[PDB]
Each structure stands twice: as structure tokens, then as C-alpha cells.
Subunit: 183 residues, 3 copies
């Protein structure tokens, strides 16, 4: 349905150049474009799989030896893309689930699976660092639905030994709600 | 008078879960709830000592092996708690004092002592990292009073070899004032 | 024309004290005053070279063994100073150039040379870390002028093996423009 493309670079200038080139190269939307660590840079793009593969090929080729890593995740539910670039709005607040993973790939796949197997809202997906760092997703919905989402996402990261922790919180305390849903 | 409770975790999901649980567990107010370093998480709570000990016991027990450290500081002047969660308002601007310490414990105890031995306003308490990192307090008041506060806070951190630096600045330059008092 | 003074310290309290003292010491303007890394602090000042040398001597002497490094860059074009403290406004948007360097010294000298050899606007100068970290400048102007600026700045950092990467982007994509010009 949509693809996600990721490109991580050692150079900020190279990253702006690559972001520019990738956007001109194909019909894709920028989801993420930011520096991280002591001078690294991360681009994430979405769009149809052909356009994303073409963007990330362009960018990988431009990156040369300043490339940390790049990846194309095909077949990602469309609702995941806005959870990566911002926050989705919460349509139902009974429970919150959070799944924390090693690597943004594990976290996107887990969220995709969560959204495909349940009816929760994927509220947001957050990366501590880069492609290889700690990442976590937050889901919101009725307690049964959140339980199911979290189970599937946990299983998904867990098969690969990349699950860090999972939690279902029915009725989140008012003092934690905003942080959970806005970051 | 109030207690401060601190809980530091290796997991963001676990931290949200623990924050939620601690708040439901006892009558305490969240002062701090934030990620730090490459994917760590810090909770700080305040309230009556019984409620804080009960919150932090709950959270410590939930944390398991994802716990970095937890602590309860009893008997902390109430004015310290808002300096931890935000900024106290400045009632008098003649001088600013700053004491920088190793560890937020050394810094809270030093600030408490400062406030108990002088009449300064504790404007804010700031942590670079977590529980074990660099922290500093800023006080404001008449120059004599600030001198006394800074002396006591310095002595307090210094007894333990945790004083990093101390400074009294009568009449702070206009170009540094806001940074001193707002961070 | 103007000088830039830089003072990097291991102590935040010492840094506030030194910033205060440097500003009282000479007719200089604070450009930068911020913490970085796990509890470091950076001051940058501008003004006439005499006043900047006097400020930084004062601050170096105050810093003692908490000094990481200090430097005075004489003869810097005035337009560089606002690019360090904020953003200069863009008067012409045909192309953007970006030069990324090792060390803020290499980056300021390169930008100065860029501005002295071309007619571009220096939009901003950015530091990832401190004095020794990754830094980059962004210039904007007609494509020929930007090509010339970037060439000169590249040569300048490159003579010393401190050039990381350089890029000219005629017609920057709308989705990258704001990040390029505002950071």
C-alpha cells in the first residue's frame, strides 16, 4: 500500500543534497529529515513502492561512503506514514499500548503488523537515535484491541530478538496522557 | 516537609508504564518525566514522604532489571519541587548564585540546604543528563543572602567531593540574565 | 572588520560566570551561549578586535583548568556574526550552497572567505557540537555566485584537511528549502 524509504548519512551537507535529489527523483513525500548523534543525518520518505525504490537508489548512489544504511520497507499501511512524520489523532482513548524495539525497521514492521491485525489507532512512532537505535510506537484504542495490537507487534519484534519492552495501559493517568500521545 | 522520588530506567516504554503506575499508587505529583541519553528515561515525583516511598517502591518493583537507580530524598523544602519541574519566579534580582554538582541527589540536597539556611529564591534546578550526571541550581536574592546560600550548598556537595563549581554574580549582565534565570 | 571570540568550558556554572565577566569586560556582543555534550558550555562573542581579545583573555583567565579551548578570529566580515547568532535573511533564492567542515574555526574562516570572494548571502552557520565538532554554513544567491562561494570555502577548509563535504543546489526542492535556510 505505501512504502517507507530510509537513508542514514554521516554528513549533514550530503544529507541535504541527497534529500533534495531524492525528492526531485520520484513522487515521494519527505516524512523525516533531521540530524542526530554528533553530526549524522536521517531521511525517511514515503510513497508508492516504485517511487520509493527509485528515490532511495538515487540517494544511496549519491551518499557513497557517507552512507550509514538505507532500506525500503514495502507494503506498509498508509496510517503508519503520518505516525512517523507527526502524530495521528486519537479517535479513542480507553487504553494506550507501547512497544519499544531495537532499530526503526523492527519498529515500523511491528507497527504495520499491529495496524493490520487490530483496529487501534497508531498514534506515533518515535526514534531515539537513527536506523539502529531504540524506537517505540504508541497505539490507542479499546483495551481488547490494544492488547491484540501489542501482542502482534511484540511477536513481530520478538521473533528477531529486537523487542525491548511492551506495555498495555488501560485508563492512562491524566498526568501521563499527553506525554504518551504527543511525545 | 516534601519528599522527592527519583526513578531512572533503561526503557522508555517501561518508564511510561512505571510513571503511570506510580501516579496511580499514591498521592504524588509528577515533577519530571523525560527521556535522556541514547534511550534512557527519568521520573521524578514529589509529595509527602509516605506517598513518595510507596510510589518509588511500586516503580522500583515494576522496573526490574531495567532500573538504573531510584532514591527517595526525605525532608526537602517545598520550594525545591517547582524549581525541579519548572522555574520559580524571581522576587529579587540583586545577585544570582549558581552551584554545579555531580549527581542530582547532591544538587537537590545542596539546594535544600541553601533554601533552609538563607532567604534566597531557588529559581531552578537543572540536570544535564540523569541521576548521576552534571546538575546545577540557580538562586537569586540580595548579594549577602546569595553568598550565604552558595556557601552552604557548596559545603554540602563539597563534603562528598561532588562540588564542581560555585559562583556568586552580583548585578548579572543583561545579556546573561535570562539564560541564568530561565535556562 | 569584526572579530569572533570563542571560549569553551567544562563547567556550566563557570561558563555563566565567564560570560558575565566577558560581557562586562569589553564592548562585545554575545553571539552564542549554550551548553553542549554531556555538560559542556560554549560562549561566542563578537565586536572590534581589541575588545574581543580583551574579553577572551578575561574569560580564559577565569576558566583556568575548566577551559576546553579559546580562540580569537580577527577580521571576519560583519555579516558572519548574525549568521552565527541566528539566521540572516535571504535576499535571493536561486541556489543554496552548503559547506561542512571539521571545527567551527575552519567553518567561520571558510564562510568569511566565501562572503569576501562572492556576493552570496551567508544565511547561517551551524555547530553540531563545540569548537572541535562538525559545523556547516549555508549560503544563498545566484547559482554562479554560490558556485564561487562554495569553491572558495571548500578550498579554505580543504587546505587544512578539514573539509567534510560541499554541495551546490540550484533550485532547492520546496520540501527541503525551509530546513536549508532555517535549520
Amino acid at each position: 500500500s505505501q512504502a517507507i524509504g530510509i537513508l542514514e548519512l554521516t554528513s549533514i551537507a550530503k544529507g541535504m543534497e541527497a534529500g533534495d535529489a531524492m525528492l526531485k527523483s520520484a513522487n515521494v513525500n519527505l516524512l523525516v529529515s533531521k540530524t542526530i548523534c554528533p553530526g549524522k543525518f536521517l531521511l525517511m520518505l514515503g510513497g508508492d513502492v516504485g517511487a520509493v525504490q527509485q528515490a532511495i537508489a538515487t540517494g544511496t548512489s549519491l551518499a557513497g561512503d557517507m552512507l550509514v544504511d538505507s532500506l525500503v520497507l514495502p507494503n506498509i499501511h498508509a496510517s503508519v506514514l503520518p505516525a512517523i512524520s507527526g502524530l495521528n489523532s486519537v479517535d479513542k482513548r480507553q487504553a494506550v499500548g507501547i512497544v519499544e524495539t531495537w532499530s526503526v525497521a523492527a519498529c515500523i514492521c511491528a507497527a504495520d503488523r499491529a495496524v493490520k491485525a487490530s483496529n487501534v489507532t497508531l498514534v506515533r512512532v518515535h526514534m531515539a537515535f537513527g536506523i539502529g537505535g531504540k524506537c517505540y510506537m504508541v497505539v490507542a484504542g479499546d483495551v481488547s484491541d490494544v492488547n491484540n495490537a501489542v501482542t502482534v507487534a511484540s511477536e513481530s519484534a520478538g521473533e528477531k530478538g529486537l523487542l525491548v519492552y511492551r506495555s498495555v495501559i488501560p485508563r492512562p493517568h491524566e498526568s501521563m496522557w499527553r506525554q504518551m500521545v504527543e511525545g
